[PDB]
Amino acid sequence: NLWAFVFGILGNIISFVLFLAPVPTFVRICKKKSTEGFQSLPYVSALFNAMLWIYYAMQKDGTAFLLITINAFGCVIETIYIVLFVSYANKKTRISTLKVLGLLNFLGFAAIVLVCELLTKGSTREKVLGGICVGFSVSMFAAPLSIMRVVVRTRSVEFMPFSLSLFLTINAVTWLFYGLAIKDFYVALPNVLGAFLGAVQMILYIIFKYYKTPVAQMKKYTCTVCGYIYNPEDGDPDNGVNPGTDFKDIPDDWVCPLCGVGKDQFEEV
Numbered sequence: 001n002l003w004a005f006v007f008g009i010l011g012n013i014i015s016f017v018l019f020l021a022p023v024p025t026f027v028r029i030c031k032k033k034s035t036e037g038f039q040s041l042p043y044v045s046a047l048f049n050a051m052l053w054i055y056y057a058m059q060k061d062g063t064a065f066l067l068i069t070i071n072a073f074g075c076v077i078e079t080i081y082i083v084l085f086v087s088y089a090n091k092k093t094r095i096s097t098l099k100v101l102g103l104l105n106f107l108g109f110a111a112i113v114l115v116c117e118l119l120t121k122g123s124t125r126e127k128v129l130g131g132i133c134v135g136f137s138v139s140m141f142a143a144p145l146s147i148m149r150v151v152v153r154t155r156s157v158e159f160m161p162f163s164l165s166l167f168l169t170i171n172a173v174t175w176l177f178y179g180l181a182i183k184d185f186y187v188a189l190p191n192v193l194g195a196f197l198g199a200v201q202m203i204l205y206i207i208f209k210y211y212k213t214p215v216a217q218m219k220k221y222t223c224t225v226c227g228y229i230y231n232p233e234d235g236d237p238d239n240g241v242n243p244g245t246d247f248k249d250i251p252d253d254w255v256c257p258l259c260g261v262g263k264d265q266f267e268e269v
């Protein structure tokens with residue numbers, strides 16, 4: 001049907017973009033000739049997921065062509081990210097990555113093919129594969145949930161840029177509507193989860209972006225006995241007050257580092 005086509009094209013465009021999201025990261029990694037502190041799990045994952053979904057679609061044949069084309073392109077692009085990463089990786093990390101690549105992507109996937117080609121056909125095949133795709137896709141939500149957890153725990157949104165959230169959300173509702181059009185609730189349900197979590201991400205961003213007060217706008221205070229000036233940007237490290245500390249967040253048993261008088265003797269500049 002026409003609808004499924006519109007949402008297929010849309011889904012492909014948006015998801016294409018999201019597949020090109022790690023590119024600056026890899027421009028970096030190619031610069032430094034090191035994978036730095038980056039992990040290969042998102043990539044090994046994204047590839048395994050893409051493969052599972054291609055496999056799922058080949059069972060649905062005709063309608064689901066559009067959820068192959070994107071996943072197909074996934075397989076390539078992720079395969080690229082994996083190669084580069086393994087090129088510029090630590091020996092230790094190189095081997096970690098290769099091991100997970102052999103377990104999940106080669107063996108795991110092969111076992112899945114083996115179990116599906118010889119234990120199911122037809123509808124039972126659809127249900128098995130679908131169940132597995134839903135399961136894995138859902139499991140991949142651990143990374144964004146982790147990110148959310150960090151954002152709330154840290155009251156910052158540095159690790160969670162707004163546009164990634166937006167694009168993930170739009171991707172989610174697009175493939176949701178897509179699943180609805182081909183009446184496939186294996187494609188649709190985890191996109192419900194995804195759209196929900198994305199919305200919650202945008203909400204968290206709007207809430208926590210300007211939570212902490214910028215060190216710049218923090219107020220200087222002065223000891224009216226010493227003349228001493230407290231710089232929040234400088235803080236008072238030698239006496240257990242890390243730089244960037246606000247004056248009001250300083251423990252009330254703190255004193256003027258020069259004069260030695262109480263905090264009550266201080267007044268804003």
Ligand SMILES: Nc1ccn([C@H]2C[C@H](O)[C@@H](COP(=O)(O)O)O2)c(=O)n1
Nearest residue numbers: 015018019070071137175187190191
């Ligand atoms: N519940 C899901 C999860 C994923 N995908 C497919 C659609 C996208 O083509 C790809 C997601 O790619 P990405 O988010 O990286 O852009 O996975 C899907 O059809 N249904």
